[PDB]
């Protein structure tokens, strides 16, 4: 019996998973011929096809954040597949100055051997996987394929947070949320942040199963004072 916990490692399989979640029809049921043909294109064996269909249909209906549940119910009117943003950073980003407010505001700022970089000016290339709304509260999404968690014990609530402190995914939090914040300011006419944001979901793509609450889904709400001070630091 195959399982997503038995799926092999590498970066090309992660690209396979990303390509599977590129072109879907969330409301419509999965076409078995189409997904096995996509598996033909990726050069894998056909032995993993039915567990792949079951895994896709499981993650399609997953109740990610207690509202907007079963993302098979995501209308194409309110989706935005794979945006790309450029964010200017002038007045050089001092690493310790950013780490100061990261330690101050973010509660996940305990695991910090930080600042592997030097002050760089200019813009910031970045790719958001999916941004969508559920009657306001624009959900931020980013799929991630990750380690060989042989059982569900490697996909608990706190091992996830420890691993995401290990890989410094919090900088991804504040950068993506500041991007979405300034984008909604530029686009939506005079919105309130605490009224319309409803933000982060980092869907750990592996380690999700059929009927299991809080297994592979993580949620962050930014502190809303961190973002304003950080935006002032960028555009001072």
């Amino acid at each position: 019996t195959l399982t997503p916990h038995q799926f092999p490692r590498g970066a090309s399989p992660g690209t396979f998973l990303h390509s599977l979640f590129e072109d879907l029809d969330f409301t419509q049921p999965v076409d078995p011929n189409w997904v096995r043909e996509k598996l033909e294109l990726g050069g894998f064996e056909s032995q993993w096809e039915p567990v792949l269909t079951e895994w896709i249909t499981a993650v399609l209906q997953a109740p990610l954040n207690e509202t907007g549940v079963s993302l098979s119910q995501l209308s194409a009117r309110n989706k935005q597949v794979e945006m790309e943003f450029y964010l200017p950073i002038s007045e050089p980003l001092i690493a310790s100055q950013l780490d100061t407010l990261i330690r101050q505001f973010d509660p996940l700022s305990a695991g910090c051997p930080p600042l592997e970089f030097m002050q760089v000016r200019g813009m910031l290339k970045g790719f958001i996987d999916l941004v969508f709304r559920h009657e306001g509260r624009y959900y931020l999404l980013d799929y991630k394929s990750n380690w060989l968690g042989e059982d569900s014990s490697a996909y608990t609530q706190q091992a996830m947070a420890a691993a995401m402190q290990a890989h410094r995914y919090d900088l991804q939090y504040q950068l993506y949320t500041l991007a979405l914040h300034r984008y909604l300011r530029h686009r939506i006419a005079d919105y309130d942040y605490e009224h319309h944001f409803g933000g982060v979901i980092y869907l750990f793509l592996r380690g999700v199963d059929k009927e299991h609450p809080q297994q592979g889904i993580y949620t962050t709400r930014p502190n809303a004072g961190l973002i304003a001070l950080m935006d002032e630091m960028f555009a001072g």
Binding site: M83, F85, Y86, P88, M123, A179
Partner: peptide, 14 residues
Amino acid sequence: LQMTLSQKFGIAAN
């Protein structure tokens, strides 16, 4: 165009 739009507005996406 992306870089100049971002420099004026703050972010140029979509």
